[PDB]
Design an enzyme around this catalytic site. Structure first.
Site, mmCIF file in Angstrom:
data_model
loop_
_atom_site.group_PDB
_atom_site.id
_atom_site.type_symbol
_atom_site.label_atom_id
_atom_site.label_comp_id
_atom_site.label_asym_id
_atom_site.label_seq_id
_atom_site.Cartn_x
_atom_site.Cartn_y
_atom_site.Cartn_z
ATOM 1 N N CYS A 59 0.895 -1.120 0.059
ATOM 2 C CA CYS A 59 -0.148 -0.085 0.230
ATOM 3 C C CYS A 59 1.020 1.061 0.020
ATOM 4 O O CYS A 59 2.045 1.251 -0.792
ATOM 5 C CB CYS A 59 -0.806 -0.131 1.217
ATOM 6 S SG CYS A 59 -0.124 -0.541 2.775
ATOM 7 N N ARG A 67 -3.251 -1.631 5.128
ATOM 8 C CA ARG A 67 -4.032 -2.421 4.199
ATOM 9 C C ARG A 67 -3.519 -3.471 3.730
ATOM 10 O O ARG A 67 -3.948 -4.707 3.645
ATOM 11 C CB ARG A 67 -4.382 -1.546 3.059
ATOM 12 C CG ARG A 67 -5.135 -0.298 3.000
ATOM 13 C CD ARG A 67 -5.240 0.573 1.988
ATOM 14 N NE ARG A 67 -5.526 1.834 1.991
ATOM 15 C CZ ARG A 67 -5.802 3.053 1.224
ATOM 16 N NH1 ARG A 67 -5.478 2.574 0.001
ATOM 17 N NH2 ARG A 67 -6.047 3.962 1.631
ATOM 18 N N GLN A 102 -2.875 -0.748 11.040
ATOM 19 C CA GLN A 102 -2.739 0.734 11.754
ATOM 20 C C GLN A 102 -3.629 1.145 12.476
ATOM 21 O O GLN A 102 -3.282 2.049 13.387
ATOM 22 C CB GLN A 102 -2.349 1.680 10.431
ATOM 23 C CG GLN A 102 -1.150 1.626 9.754
ATOM 24 C CD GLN A 102 -0.913 2.520 8.900
ATOM 25 O OE1 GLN A 102 -1.347 2.553 7.665
ATOM 26 N NE2 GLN A 102 -0.398 3.642 9.053
#
Ligand SMILES: COc1ccc(CN)cc1OC
Length: 281
Positions: free
Chosen positions: A214, A220, A261
């Site tokens: 990503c 992601r 994240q």
């Protein structure tokens, strides 16, 4: 069972709390090679570094460094390279890594521009007749075909080693609809995409590890690997419900920092695995 655990955390709204326990339990290993001053311009983000123990090394004597990690999931017999979106100056290094590691697939989970900023260099050709030459790494890349669907694009690429005149076919899987903020409302198009990567043979042990990226190679990218590994373990084990997402995530975090994240990405990972289990039982 995770479906029950899902409703508990959701009804209690404890996602930020679960997420914090993961951050506090996560491994911390040295990343000395990443912090060398000669590597400053090989890193997109100064706080996202590969650990020395799991970093991919380029086979060039000069500077072997790329922001890329080998995730090895021993029980699932799965390996992934997670990397950042290449920079203008690392596009040649990216393709050298793909070549050297004998990868068959590249999985891209971002758009080149998001939130009005560049998240990634344009590292593949836009037209058949306009190939790209990477002079620093002596590779040529040609677009062979492009199949654009509503949620993702698949591209067939030919990578040629100009030094030896060997060629390989690389599949580029580009998930184009991850929203600028937050996570998809439903995991259906993400699961479809993950099953398409699997069907290609790109995740199979007869090839080098798939390259997944990503912008930073942790958020992601993390969701992709976590969902794939969890669903695989559910098809391997005598008791499918022995699969603990939180344990799997902590194992992957031994190999690259910061995978997943936000608490939203964690919730989304649970939802993807819970939904994917239906199509697998
Ligand atoms: C292709 O081989 C495998 C891949 C994954 C698993 C998952 N434990 C088992 C395998 O045995 C064959």
């Amino acid at each position: 069972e995770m479906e029950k655990e899902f409703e508990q955390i959701d009804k209690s709204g404890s996602w930020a709390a679960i997420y914090q326990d993961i951050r506090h339990e996560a491994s911390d290993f040295p990343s000395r090679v990443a912090k060398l001053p000669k590597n400053k311009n090989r890193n997109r983000y100064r706080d996202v570094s590969p650990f020395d123990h799991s970093r991919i090394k380029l086979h060039q004597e000069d500077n072997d460094y790329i922001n890329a990690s080998l995730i090895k999931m021993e029980e699932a017999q799965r390996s992934y390279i997670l990397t950042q979106g290449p920079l203008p100056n690392t596009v040649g290094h990216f393709w050298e890594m793909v070549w050297e590691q004998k990868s068959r697939g590249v999985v891209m989970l971002n758009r080149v521009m998001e939130k009005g900023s560049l998240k990634c260099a344009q590292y593949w050709p836009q037209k058949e007749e306009k190939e790209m030459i990477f002079e620093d790494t002596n590779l040529k890349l040609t677009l062979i075909s492009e199949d654009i669907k509503s949620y993702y694009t698949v591209r067939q690429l030919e990578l040629e080693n100009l030094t030896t005149q060997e060629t390989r076919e690389i599949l580029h899987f580009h998930y184009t609809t991850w929203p600028d903020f937050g996570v998809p409302e439903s995991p259906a198009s993400f699961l479809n995409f993950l099953f398409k990567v699997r069907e290609s043979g790109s995740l199979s042990p007869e090839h080098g590890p798939v390259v997944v990226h990503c912008s930073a190679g942790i958020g992601r990218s993390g969701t992709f690997c976590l969902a794939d590994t969890c669903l695989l373990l559910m098809d391997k084990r005598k008791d499918p419900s022995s699969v603990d997402i939180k344990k799997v995530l902590l194992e992957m975090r031994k190999f690259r920092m910061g995978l997943i994240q936000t608490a939203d990405q964690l919730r989304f990972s649970y939802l993807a695995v819970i939904e994917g289990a239906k199509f697998i039982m």
